[PDB]
Design a protein around this motif. Structure first.
Motif, PDB file in Angstrom:
ATOM      1  N   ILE A 434     -14.657  14.591   2.182  1.00 36.08           N
ATOM      2  CA  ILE A 434     -14.117  14.520   3.531  1.00 36.08           C
ATOM      3  C   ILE A 434     -15.001  13.660   4.434  1.00 36.08           C
ATOM      4  O   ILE A 434     -14.503  12.894   5.260  1.00 36.08           O
ATOM      5  CB  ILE A 434     -13.970  15.938   4.139  1.00 36.08           C
ATOM      6  N   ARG A 435     -16.314  13.780   4.289  1.00 39.24           N
ATOM      7  CA  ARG A 435     -17.202  12.979   5.120  1.00 39.24           C
ATOM      8  C   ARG A 435     -17.046  11.500   4.770  1.00 39.24           C
ATOM      9  O   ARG A 435     -17.055  10.638   5.648  1.00 39.24           O
ATOM     10  CB  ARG A 435     -18.658  13.404   4.936  1.00 39.24           C
ATOM     11  N   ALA A 436     -16.908  11.217   3.475  1.00 34.63           N
ATOM     12  CA  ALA A 436     -16.734   9.856   2.992  1.00 34.63           C
ATOM     13  C   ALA A 436     -15.501   9.264   3.657  1.00 34.63           C
ATOM     14  O   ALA A 436     -15.507   8.121   4.075  1.00 34.63           O
ATOM     15  CB  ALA A 436     -16.580   9.852   1.480  1.00 34.63           C
ATOM     16  N   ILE A 437     -14.438  10.046   3.761  1.00 31.30           N
ATOM     17  CA  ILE A 437     -13.234   9.562   4.408  1.00 31.30           C
ATOM     18  C   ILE A 437     -13.528   9.271   5.872  1.00 31.30           C
ATOM     19  O   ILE A 437     -13.120   8.243   6.400  1.00 31.30           O
ATOM     20  CB  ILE A 437     -12.080  10.590   4.323  1.00 31.30           C
ATOM     21  N   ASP A 438     -14.237  10.178   6.532  1.00 31.52           N
ATOM     22  CA  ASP A 438     -14.570   9.981   7.936  1.00 31.52           C
ATOM     23  C   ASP A 438     -15.289   8.660   8.104  1.00 31.52           C
ATOM     24  O   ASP A 438     -14.949   7.879   8.981  1.00 31.52           O
ATOM     25  CB  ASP A 438     -15.455  11.121   8.457  1.00 31.52           C
ATOM     26  N   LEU A 439     -16.280   8.409   7.255  1.00 31.74           N
ATOM     27  CA  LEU A 439     -17.031   7.167   7.332  1.00 31.74           C
ATOM     28  C   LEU A 439     -16.117   5.966   7.156  1.00 31.74           C
ATOM     29  O   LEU A 439     -16.165   5.022   7.934  1.00 31.74           O
ATOM     30  CB  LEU A 439     -18.126   7.137   6.267  1.00 31.74           C
ATOM     31  N   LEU A 440     -15.282   6.003   6.125  1.00 32.76           N
ATOM     32  CA  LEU A 440     -14.365   4.911   5.855  1.00 32.76           C
ATOM     33  C   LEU A 440     -13.360   4.761   6.978  1.00 32.76           C
ATOM     34  O   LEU A 440     -13.010   3.649   7.341  1.00 32.76           O
ATOM     35  CB  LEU A 440     -13.625   5.138   4.535  1.00 32.76           C
ATOM     36  N   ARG A 441     -12.891   5.870   7.535  1.00 31.31           N
ATOM     37  CA  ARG A 441     -11.918   5.794   8.611  1.00 31.31           C
ATOM     38  C   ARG A 441     -12.531   5.100   9.816  1.00 31.31           C
ATOM     39  O   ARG A 441     -11.858   4.348  10.517  1.00 31.31           O
ATOM     40  CB  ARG A 441     -11.439   7.185   9.013  1.00 31.31           C
TER      41      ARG A 441
END
Lengths: 461, 461, 461
Positions: A434-441
């Motif tokens: 989920i954090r990885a997605i946040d970063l990518l987002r």
């Protein structure tokens, strides 16, 4: 023709044809009336067609951007479906080609009829033998200069139907950032964190679509049917969408175990043009120094899945998407506590072997050579397939597995069996994803690179 | 036995055997005397043997470090050669296993005789038929409890002889950081920058070993024989070493063109255990948007070189070394840096196709499919081989090519032909490679990771 | 139309188009003017086209002759280039089909434009970015019923440019009989014997074209720049032509080592339609009875070179050309002194293994089986490639290697090292090749047979 205009003409033409086809079907069911071959040849049951032309003359054409570019001058076309569902995507895409390249947009009836099954909404028609035979006989059924997009209308409808069936969810709820899991406990942990997010008034997450139908919002009485048990019986790959106002949430699909499912789910999810999909699941640790609960960041894959060999030979290299790798790596630093270099003791970056043989252990000697040759670090059954598909469909991909056991060092544990060290890690693992997605987002548009583009790469993302 | 001690016993035992063997040969040539089978069975012409034992009991064994580790407890051995040449490496390595693991070091005569050709410092003498037959008949020659190092004495002597022959340089001068080039003008540019470095008293570079023999130092009269022309006739792969007091300079080998040489040179250079080797050469740009002079950072390779298919099947993935990639990428920013643009306009990160067919253009149609399938971005003839070899021998590797032409877009220029924009990029290109080395050298020991380690990875680096 | 006539119309049409294209380029460079699409569609920048028709009615058609025949009746065409360069060849060929078959010759503008690079004489143009972009954009560039000849205009121009670049020699100087070597010392020995020939007034050899530019004739001051050292740095495959008045001299190309080069050089040399090319180089002796210095006449090849596997599967048999074998054999008798059956002690006829792995020794066990299975007698790195290419391009070929060492029996030497015995054989070896050519040259037209003809073999040789 302009963007906003093209969208409206597509909407109109589409609604018209679906309404028209539904009507014809109704008449055949009630009176036995057939449609006149003349009106059909005029685009009665036809998908709108979208064409964008480019003269090839532009002062400073974007040559660094990943998507929305023209390789040459000419006309690019494609049949369109569900303009309303793809409104944003279609707009965003037409806009780029309209300004940066000053292109000629035009909308008009195609030569392709919408198969009747895709216009029948409520529930499948349950007509008798003759009625059916008559339908597939007199109506548009499904059959077996340059492309403007990756998939044509029929391919998209085919997949939108499947996505819903397999997922137990409406395709309108799917979010841009996807997470794939091979373990039931991951959705449990996800739904929990999700419901939690909904309540917190600072979280952008305002709703949670659930496999099976349940729609959970800030004001929902007893949010327990979030994970209806009947879901895992009715849907082979249950999904859960954590929607946000601007549709930038996180979708999680529990693809189950096996390359077949990983392949299948991606074949259809691809048409929704996700921004990225990550593999968040368990794996076997093949290195002695590895400890159950440790993480594995895949940087290469030994494709023993077979499932994609024909369309993508094993000697074709599947690379890593640097941006996605950073995201997964940094997310493991932040979420795994120890902020810094100490990650190297919990995280291992290496080659993962994906196999379609659940009982590969019974043939270790025969695989041992390749395991060593590829310097394999972990073994799973979905990774490579997810990566390959991401590669094939130009959807950024990444894999961050969690060691659930060590097959080669006496500790063969199964998912579900008592395994405190793996089980303990599950929530943290999901958070890394989920954090990885946040970063990518946050990385906004910078996310997409050119590592997935082909020579004949379509103008649309 | 301790490090410094082991080294000395190795030196002694070695010198002894070589001197002994040279003696025996001299006697056979002058009188016709043969050595007594008894003294030989006692280790007369034998390489020293080095054994390191580990009980397996250590409180906190290094499990994150890339090299100098023990997978299990037991005895690791190996024959040694040129202890003086490997003094540093041998010390540094024994030291690690001696402290961090508290191991038992022992040096003693092995059961392997030093092939007479490796002890004869002088090329050929004057032996006739009988003389020779007698030599190969009565003396040691090359004939075709666990591994302590990657290569054994005979393999190392074999390669050291080749390295010298191919390079036209003494193996003692080779530096830890290697640069491979496929174009003559790169050495010109290198020698220039080198001689310049030598003069600057702040530069660590104090000497320049040149293919052919020339040794250039701060005080050398007319440093013009730096690039003796007779070199390219006498040596297939001329090398140039920019030595520093502590032996941390830069070695540059002009491997020429073709996968055969790339493979061959690495087979031998591998025994010197380099810290990293980079491919700094020209390539063809396969993408429309690419411009002659642009850079390509390889992140994957389509292996059409054939040369390594037997030992490393094409379906075994060759990954990228993140550290090396960062170095190459940052070096491109610093050295190519333009205030007012992203490197993304000059640098492209993608898949490179390495072929063994110089005239691949004559078969484009047949290749086109795979080019597209692999999303190829550039084509060369050494990259993949260098990378695969690096992978095979655990030598960090990286590829940063420079587009010298665009085969698919009307500009099929050849190396040597006029190329205003490539030729003008060559110096900057070499500097990017040199800078990347600087960055990696600074990263100290952090450079080596675990992406190249095998399950049965030898204790020595 | 008749022979002499067709030749002149080709000359005319060709010069016209090149002059026309040069002009257009000049105008674009000075004023920015572009050519009118109308004149181009009229054959402005077009290669002459040559067509020969045959009704199929001839009393006694030559059915034994190797070249210049018709498989069926019909029209055979082809684009032509450098008519002046191919004057002799084109004449000799058109004459045969004109008389023996009474064919209808016709010359006229083709539909193929001459790529601008091929009309620019001096050095490659070096305009700026825009200038170049404009050139490749508005001018003819190189883009990647029955055939009258093996190669068409564009293919021939492509190769003529390469031949010059790789060879450092003008294509006009190339002689009908070619000798390929893989060792520098062979050219030394050749140039020597050549300069010698030039001086002797009975020798037909009147000039020596040298890689790099040097033109040496009977009256040349200090014939030392015959083997300019800068050649081996500027040209990957240096050539030396020993021209004779009637252009029946000997061309020697030092192809270096490796199958890539062997393939590459033949791809281009083939367009000059040589009479024969021989492989005169060193090899490894695989048989215990062999002695360094002995000769090996190949009668079959074990193709481990990979380089041609795609275009010519390994299971396609590459035969020996009887005439060429006799020539090599007889030349070995004459030049090696003692004839009769004594040659059998210095010469061995057998199967040669050509590999692309210079360090095949490191994998002997893996190769051993096939070596035995193929009854291999020697191992090299060019033979099979040269042979296969000769086969592919209908250029008689042959291989006579000289054992430079015995890998399997202690002496693993290196052609480039101190090899008293091999070095001594070099001159004799080159002479055997030269004598073999003399014999074949004497055999006049009888040289060519039908062992290389295909079913659809083109009328031209």
């Amino acid at each position: 023709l302009t963007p906003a205009q093209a969208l409206d003409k597509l909407d109109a033409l589409y609604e018209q044809s679906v309404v028209a086809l539904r009507n014809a079907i109704g008449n055949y069911i009630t009176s036995g009336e057939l449609p006149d071959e003349n009106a059909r040849k005029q685009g009665l049951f036809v998908y709108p067609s979208l064409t964008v032309t480019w003269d090839g003359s532009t002062t400073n054409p974007p040559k660094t951007r990943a998507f929305g570019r023209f390789t040459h001058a000419g006309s690019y076309t494609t049949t369109i479906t569900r303009p309303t569902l793809f409104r944003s995507y279609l707009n965003e895409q037409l806009t780029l080609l309209y300004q940066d390249y000053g292109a000629h947009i035009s909308v008009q009836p195609s030569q392709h009829e919408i198969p009747y099954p895709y216009v029948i909404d409520g529930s499948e028609l349950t007509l008798d033998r003759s009625m059916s035979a008559g339908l597939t006989r007199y109506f548009p059924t499904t059959e077996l200069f340059s492309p403007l997009s990756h998939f044509d209308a029929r391919r998209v409808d085919f997949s939108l139907a499947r996505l819903r069936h397999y997922t137990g969810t409406p395709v309108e709820h799917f979010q841009p950032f996807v997470l794939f899991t091979n373990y039931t406990r991951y959705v449990d942990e996800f739904v929990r964190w999700g419901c939690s997010q909904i309540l917190d008034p600072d979280s952008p997450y305002i709703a949670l679509s659930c496999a099976g139908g349940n729609w959970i919002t800030a004001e929902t009485e007893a949010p327990e049917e979030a994970i209806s048990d009947l879901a895992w019986k009715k849907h082979q790959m249950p999904a859960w969408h954590l929607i946000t106002a601007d549709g930038q949430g996180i979708t999680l699909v529990n693809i189950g175990v096996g390359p077949s499912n990983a392949k299948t789910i991606c074949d259809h999810l691809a048409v929704l043009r996700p921004d990225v999909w990550l593999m968040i699941g368990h794996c076997g640790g093949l290195r002695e120094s590895q400890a159950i609960g440790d993480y594995v960041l895949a940087h290469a894959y030994l494709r023993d899945d077979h499932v994609l060999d024909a369309v993508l030979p094993p000697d074709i290299p599947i690379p890593s998407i640097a941006e996605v790798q950073r995201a997964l790596y940094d997310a493991t630093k932040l979420v795994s506590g120890r902020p810094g270099e100490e990650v190297k003791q919990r995280l291992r970056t290496g080659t993962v072997v994906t196999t379609d043989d659940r009982n590969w252990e019974l043939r270790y000697s025969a695989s041992a050579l390749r395991f060593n040759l590829s310097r394999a670090v972990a073994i799973d059954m979905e990774s490579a397939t997810i990566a390959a598909q991401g590669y094939r469909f130009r959807v950024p991909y990444g894999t961050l597995l969690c060691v659930s056991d060590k097959p080669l060092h006496g500790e063969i544990k199964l998912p579900g069996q008592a395994n405190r060290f793996y089980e303990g890690a599950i929530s943290e693992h999901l958070q890394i994803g989920i954090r990885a997605i946040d970063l990518l987002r946050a990385e906004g548009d910078r996310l997409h690179s050119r590592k997935l583009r082909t020579f004949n790469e379509p103008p649309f993302r």
